[PDB]
């Protein structure tokens, strides 16, 4: 669980924009 | 002392300083961000002796850096005296 991802936000991101959330269950 | 509690710094750059040298001298910059890249231009002009003197010149670019952040406001910093 050291890697997380986002699927809810007000608006989509900008090109080459790093916005600094849920985690993947990588099994 | 301008800042405080520097945290998770994601970009840095150090090189020869920007601002080189009776007449008030005018220096021309352009600050522009494109798809994450921060573009910086430069130019220097000696100006006789307020108002912008009616004349014509050109601005060279200097360097471009991919800061990649969302920008909406800017605040120009200056010294007390």
Swiss-Prot record, chain B:
Question: Which part of the complete sequence is present?
Answer: 158 to 245 of 1273
The record's subunit annotation is: Binds to host ACE2. RBD also interacts with the N-linked glycan on 'Asn-90' of ACE2. Cleavage of S generates a polybasic C-terminal sequence on S1 that binds to host Neuropilin-1 (NRP1) and Neuropilin-2 (NRP2) receptors. Interacts with host integrin alpha-5/beta-1 (ITGA5:ITGB1) and with ACE2 in complex with integrin alpha-5/beta-1 (ITGA5:ITGB1). May interact via cytoplasmic c-terminus with M protein. May interact (via N-terminus) with host bilirubin and biliverdin, thereby preventing antibody binding to the SARS-CoV-2 spike NTD via an allosteric mechanism.
What is the species of this protein?
Severe acute respiratory syndrome coronavirus 2 (2019-nCoV)
Which protein is depicted?
Spike protein S1
Which positions are glycosylated?
Answer: 8, 70
Summarizing the annotation, the consequence of altering residue 27 to S is: In strain: Gamma/P.1
Function, as annotated:
Attaches the virion to the cell membrane by interacting with host receptor, initiating the infection. The major receptor is host ACE2. When S2/S2' has been cleaved, binding to the receptor triggers direct fusion at the cell membrane. When S2/S2' has not been cleaved, binding to the receptor results in internalization of the virus by endocytosis using host TFRC and GRM2 and leading to fusion of the virion membrane with the host endosomal membrane. Alternatively, may use NRP1/NRP2 and integrin as entry receptors.
